[PDB]
């Protein structure tokens, strides 16, 4: 064993052809997939990934495990970039889009060893998908709480899941409250709002859901108030900085007469000081600049008990302002003047307070005019668990933004897989030929999710996998009696149940893209028959 030599065709690098490379690819994808096949399902578990300094992170987000795990090799990166696509597209389904991909190559490859051209296998998988995508719309349905359910089942393989009921609720709640219309209709749920925060202390359950937003800052000078308004407040969402001006980059102050020295000088302080006044003089009780504040132009807010926060997160102010109806003041101008325009640009908020959280202490803008908004704040044992709590609070809360934007769900629990399996499997004879083996493989291959969903329970999973297999195989006999697919796995107990009833819901939009995608990879790799690796520099 071991490929080698060259003889003719002098090439500045490595080059494997046929069997040799074609297997290498399959091995590659295989390994990168197998690392995260033990994180699949509720019975699946997280892992710790230590660096060189010794620090680490524990996480089940397949996409971050494959990101965090240094992968060197095309077909390896491919499935790490494909695991990426998911987390970037829908937001959950990563761990699974890879396990599928790997399974398609691994399998398809076997067909080639049997002497079956790659293309004939490719078209075969292509048709198995056409039929499979269509059929996927024959298990799904319109939203008919489906929400607190979607948000829950998406926390099974996660840390946040021991307290499913709690967060499953806080998730939908928080998201919903932020909805908007983008432009011309839409009604999209902010694919990123709800500033999430975390602080070590108290229970996992004691995670608060602010009734507004959580801007993470103090209050400039400790001299100003730490809590303002009980009834109504005017919030100044700025952007321009209130510090001592410096004039044009090319504006030399050339003095010819010692007179002008002192004058123009102290003028500098006032120029950006007037700007301060024209803002306090608007009813501004709360100021949120983005580009920081002077300590001089701060005392002005202090002397006036105006909660004024320095250099804020501009990604928050943009949302702190849509939430108090205010205006992100780029620079007081309008036509040709200068003012933050009394309450014209200001925002209406119920109350601005600086709540503490042991060690930390941040500001809260809870209750507002047009806010609707929310923001969650995790509390855990330490950063190690906390990063992950959120990590999967997101991989969960994302499943919701898509169930919403796309009113359509399918029963997970490895049901979808089983169904497609037996359907495509029987459908496989509708073309016979060599091509049969293709679809057949495709279908058969899908049973990876149900098998591995269960094997992650140690017990002889050949049980469920067999039962669930049979069921659908039967159900599609008058698919008539009382047709009952939607039968998934209940690993916690070890039996086949109706997941739609049980509460195991997953958005169609996931398993529809998770599938169309994973094959798009498998094919571009199925075509690989020679890998020329140039020598670097």
């Amino acid at each position: 064993f071991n490929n080698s030599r060259s003889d003719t065709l002098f090439l500045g690098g490595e080059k494997i052809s046929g069997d040799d490379i074609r297997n290498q690819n399959v091995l590659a994808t295989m390994a990168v997939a197998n690392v995260v096949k033990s994180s699949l399902g509720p019975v699946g578990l997280d892992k710790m990934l230590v660096d060189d300094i010794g620090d680490f992170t524990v996480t089940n987000d397949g996409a971050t495990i494959l990101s965090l795990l240094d992968v060197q090799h095309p077909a390896g990166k491919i499935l790490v970039e494909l695991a990426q696509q998911q987390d970037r597209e829908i937001g959950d389904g990563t761990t699974s889009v890879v396990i599928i991909a790997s399974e398609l190559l691994k399998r398809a490859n076997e067909l080639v060893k049997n002497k079956i051209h790659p293309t004939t296998i490719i078209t075969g998988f292509r048709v198995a998908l056409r039929e499979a995508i269509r059929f996927i719309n024959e298990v799904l349905s319109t939203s008919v709480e489906t929400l607190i359910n979607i948000a829950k089942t998406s926390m099974s393989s996660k840390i946040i899941g021991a307290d499913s009921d709690f967060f499953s609720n806080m998730v939908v709640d928080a998201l919903l409250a932020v909805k908007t219309q983008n432009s011309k209709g839409e009604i999209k749920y902010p694919v990123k709002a709800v500033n999430v925060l975390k602080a070590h202390g108290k229970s996992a359950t004691e995670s608060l859901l602010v009734p507004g937003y959580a801007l993470n800052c103090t209050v400039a000078s400790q001299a100003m108030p730490k809590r303002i308004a009980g009834g109504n407040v005017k919030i100044a969402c700025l952007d321009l900085n209130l510090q001592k001006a410096r004039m044009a980059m090319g504006v030399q102050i050339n003095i010819d007469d010692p007179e002008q020295l002192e004058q123009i000088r102290k003028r500098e302080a006032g120029i950006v000081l007037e700007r301060v006044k024209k803002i306090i003089d608007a009813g501004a009780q709360v100021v949120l600049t983005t580009k920081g504040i002077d300590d001089l132009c701060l005392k002005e807010f202090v002397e006036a008990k105006i909660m004024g926060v320095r250099r804020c997160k501009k990604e928050d102010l943009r949302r702190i302002a849509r939430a108090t109806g205010a205006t992100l003041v780029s620079s007081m101008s309008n036509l040709e003047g200068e003012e933050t325009f009394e309450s014209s640009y200001l925002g209406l908020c119920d109350e601005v307070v600086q709540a503490k959280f042991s060690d930390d202490e941040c500001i809260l803008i809870k209750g507002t005019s047009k806010h609707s908004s929310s923001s969650i704040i995790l509390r855990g044992a330490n950063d190690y668990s906390l990063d992950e709590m959120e990590r999967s609070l997101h991989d969960s809360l994302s499943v919701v933004k898509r169930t919403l934007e796309s009113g359509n769900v399918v029963p997970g629990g490895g049901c979808v897989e089983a169904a497609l399996n037996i359907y495509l499997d029987n459908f496989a004879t509708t073309v016979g030929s060599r091509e049969q083996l293709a679809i057949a493989e495709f279908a058969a291959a899908l049973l990876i999710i149900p098998k591995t969903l269960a094997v992650n329970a140690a017990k002889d999973s050949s049980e469920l996998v067999a039962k669930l297999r049979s069921y659908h195989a039967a159900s599609q006999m008058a698919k008539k009696r009382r047709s009952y697919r939607n039968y998934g796995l209940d690993l916690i107990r070890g039996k086949i149940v109706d997941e739609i009833h049980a509460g195991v819901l997953e958005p169609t939009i996931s398993k529809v893209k998770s599938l169309k995608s994973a094959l798009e990879a498998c094919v571009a790799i199925l075509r690989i028959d020679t890998m020329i690796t140039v020598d670097p520099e």
């Binding site: 432009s183 011309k184 004039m247 044009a248 003095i255 010819d256 002008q260 123009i264 620079s331 798009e520």
Partner: protein, 186 residues
């Protein structure tokens, strides 16, 4: 003439001919975000909406108490009138050709162009110009003192649809096709 623009994400099927043309740039994050204007008139400003840019060793000296705001408040208008003349010539969507020389669209000049509800889009590569003048039917605008309503186009729609974390620009309804390609792996 067949401008193809590939954008990562989706699969191969997600590729369309796109009626009008396909730009390649972002839009506006800064002061007042427009990003979409139905039935608009666009202009390819080869100019640059920034403070006074004298190509010779310029310099603004100061030596007076009051003279402070003189210099300031003055140029504050310099950007303004230019911005008005644009709205004035009925220019809905603005396109600035990337000038590394010395600024394109001053941060300030955006507060104006923000209010004026004029979606601006900068960094239009120089090799585009020629082409954009076709697909957009637009007209290059050397100075502002040549920025006229006829040196514009009949755009029926311009919008930066965020395909999903991607964001691609479009100018629909108006000798140049413009196809956008997608797929999973680069």
């Amino acid at each position: 003439d067949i401008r193809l623009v590939k954008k990562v994400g989706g699969t191969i099927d997600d590729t369309e001919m796109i009626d009008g043309v396909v730009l390649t740039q972002t839009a506006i994050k800064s002061a007042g975000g427009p990003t979409r204007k139905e039935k608009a008139k666009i202009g390819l400003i080869q100019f640059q909406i920034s403070p006074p840019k004298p190509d010779t060793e310029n310099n603004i000296i100061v030596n007076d108490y009051r003279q402070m705001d003189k210099i300031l408040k003055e140029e504050r208008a310099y950007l303004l009138n230019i911005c008005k003349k644009i709205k004035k010539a009925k220019c809905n969507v603005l396109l600035i050709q990337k000038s590394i020389l010395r600024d394109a669209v001053n941060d300030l000049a955006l507060h104006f162009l923000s209010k004026l509800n004029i979606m601006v889009v900068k960094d239009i590569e120089r090799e585009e110009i020629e082409f954009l003048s076709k697909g957009l039917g637009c007209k290059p605008i050397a100075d502002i003192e040549l920025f006229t309503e006829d040196r514009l186009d009949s755009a029926d729609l311009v919008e930066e649809i965020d395909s999903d974390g991607s964001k691609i620009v479009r100018v629909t309804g108006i000798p140049t096709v413009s196809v956008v390609i997608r797929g999973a792996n680069n």
